[PDB]
Amino acid sequence: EERPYAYVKISDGCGSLRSRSIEDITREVEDLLKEGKKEIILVAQDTTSYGIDLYRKQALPDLLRRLNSLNGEFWIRVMYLHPDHLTEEIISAMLELDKVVKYFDVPVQHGSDKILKLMGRTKSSEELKKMLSSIRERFPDAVLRTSIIVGFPGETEEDFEELKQFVEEIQFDKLGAFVYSDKVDPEMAKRRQEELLLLQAEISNSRLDRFVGKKLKFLVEGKEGKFLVGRTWTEAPEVDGVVFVRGKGKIGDFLEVVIKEHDEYDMWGSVI
């Protein structure tokens, strides 16, 4: 197709966890770069679990290093990270490798230790926060993307309160809020959902502000009249926002753009 990006399934297990070899995934990506792809998106149920069944260890670091060394200017984006398995080896590799975009897709589900334990999550809110802050400390512009579930059976005003300061302390760039489904009523669950989103809107906008008037790499994906449509490294395809830039360019090309304004998580800028 004419899309400048491609999804690469590094494993399809969880069914039994089955990882493809580093060499097989590498050859697939090489072929993709040969056909002009500029963004490689690594996917799986849990990308941080890659290699466990084949190399007897989390080989995501090794995989990224191999892909990073492939020839050319392109992006490597990882998605579906599981916080309980996001090791320092992975974080460091992602922050170290120049072609890996500092985009961290890690849904934490909640911020209350009580609810987290009830959901089966291992790491505690304090640990999650230390991990996330650690990333931001090494790379201030790091995009942190997560998903939250409000309305979980047993969620009390106290739990939701802990969640709010949790999201306030981390300052995620992107965060989705969903309501539980199959001990808590849906009435207050709605207020909590809109409150979480209401609070996050502030945070998401604040994060986007520090990008205004700044130079970012832009991947062209389409052309609509006098506008170029595409994404800056901070945006995954389809699930995030879009960037509108006025200027000349062809699909699949990397351009330098300066964001002038944003709205509803979408951005508007110009080619520089």
Q: Which two tokens stand for residue 29?
A: 């990506």
Which part of the chain is CATH 3.80.30.20?
A: 1-212
Resolution of the structure, angstroms:
2.0
What kind of architecture, by CATH, is found in domain 1-212? Answer: Alpha-Beta Horseshoe (3.80)
Among candidate residues 242, 195, 191, the one with its CA nearest the CA of residue 218: 242
Burial degree of 108 (CB within 10 A; 0-12, 13-18, 19+): buried
Q: Say if residue 165 is exposed, middle or buried (CB neighbours under 10 Å; 0-12, 13-18, 19+).
A: exposed
Residue labelled with tokens 């398995």: 85
Coil/strand/helix, residue 223: strand
What determination technique applies here? Answer: X-ray
| 14 marked ligand binding residue | yes
DSSP 21: P
**Where in the chain are all domains bearing CATH 2.40.50.140?**
213-272
CATH architecture of the domain formed by 213-272: Beta Barrel (2.40)
**What tokens appear for 186 in the block?**
């849906």
Q: Are 256 and 262 a contacting pair, CB within 8 Å? A: no
Closest C-alpha among 189, 97, 92, 200 to residue 146: 200
